From a paper:
The self-labeling protein tags (SLPs) [name], [name]-tag, and [name]-tag allow the covalent labeling of fusion proteins with synthetic molecules for applications in bioimaging and biotechnology. To guide the selection of an SLP–substrate pair and provide guidelines for the design of substrates, we report a systematic and comparative study of the labeling kinetics and substrate specificities of [name], [name]-tag, and [name]-tag.
The HT7 variant [name] (halo-based oligonucleotide binder)52 features several positively charged surface mutations close to the substrate binding site, which were introduced to increase the labeling rates with chloroalkanes attached to oligonucleotides. These mutations lead to a small but significant increase in labeling rates (3.1-fold) with negatively charged CA substrates relative to HT7. Hence, a putative electrostatic steering effect could explain the altered substrate preference of [name] despite the fact that its positive charges are on the opposite side of the fluorophore binding site.
Residue numbers in the entry: 3 to 293
Write the structure that this text describes.
Amino acid sequence: GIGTGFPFDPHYVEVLGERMHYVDVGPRDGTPVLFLHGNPTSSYVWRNIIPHVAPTHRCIAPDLIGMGKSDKPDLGYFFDDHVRFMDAFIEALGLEEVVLVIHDWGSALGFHWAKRNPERVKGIAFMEFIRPIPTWDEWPKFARKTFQAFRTKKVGRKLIIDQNVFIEGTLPMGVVRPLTEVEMDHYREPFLNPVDREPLWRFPNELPIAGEPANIVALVEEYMDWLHQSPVPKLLFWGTPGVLIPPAEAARLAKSLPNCKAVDIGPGLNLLQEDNPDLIGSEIARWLSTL
Ligand SMILES: [Ca+2]
Ligand SMILES: [Ca+2]
Ligand SMILES: [Ca+2]
Ligand SMILES: [Ca+2]
């Protein structure tokens, strides 16, 4: 019922000497909409949101370096690595201003880029995004020991790299409805070879939890500082119970952030796109027409 196909012609562009894959549809009339996925997804996660937006706006959805159909160089796949590649991807497309639609680690990339380039951002729609997590008590109990293991020396790489737990297990556990075997094939494909799973493991180790990694905590705090000042139009989707963003936090941010509307998508964990793609895509399209 929720679409499982990926009916988008591949686009490729060389970025720092590495080929990155992206979706590019819609009319080049006006401001393009840049969709940024997180862990462990790809542009596949936007496949049922894009068709609501492409009738009126150009839609661009890259696969992060080391993910999706993009090349897979020997990197640490730290956040800093993703910043370098995403900075250069956006410059390769010869764009000017954009609207961002961002999720999970794609939201850290998007917010950090918007803070450094605010004249180029005409709106941000965001969901289940990277915020500072003061203590492990704010991580959902049902996932807490596993994410602590992900961040434990030796233990975490055995789970994520050798056993592929983030794809086989954490991914479906971040979706309320069951994922199909075709959907799982699309998500599993980039990571069928264990040596290619480094980004799946480095990302949970980059989460800003209880002050560490200090560099991530600092950068995320700084773009949240910017978001609390900037007049940029903001659209916050949120679900219950969520994962990164509990309902109480969405409610706080909908009052504190300027020019922000919050949208309740109903039941949702992390991949809100997979539980209510039609509300998310439809409401982004309505919101775009008011900018
Ligand atoms: Ca090359
Ligand atoms: Ca650790
Ligand atoms: Ca299933
Ligand atoms: Ca602050």
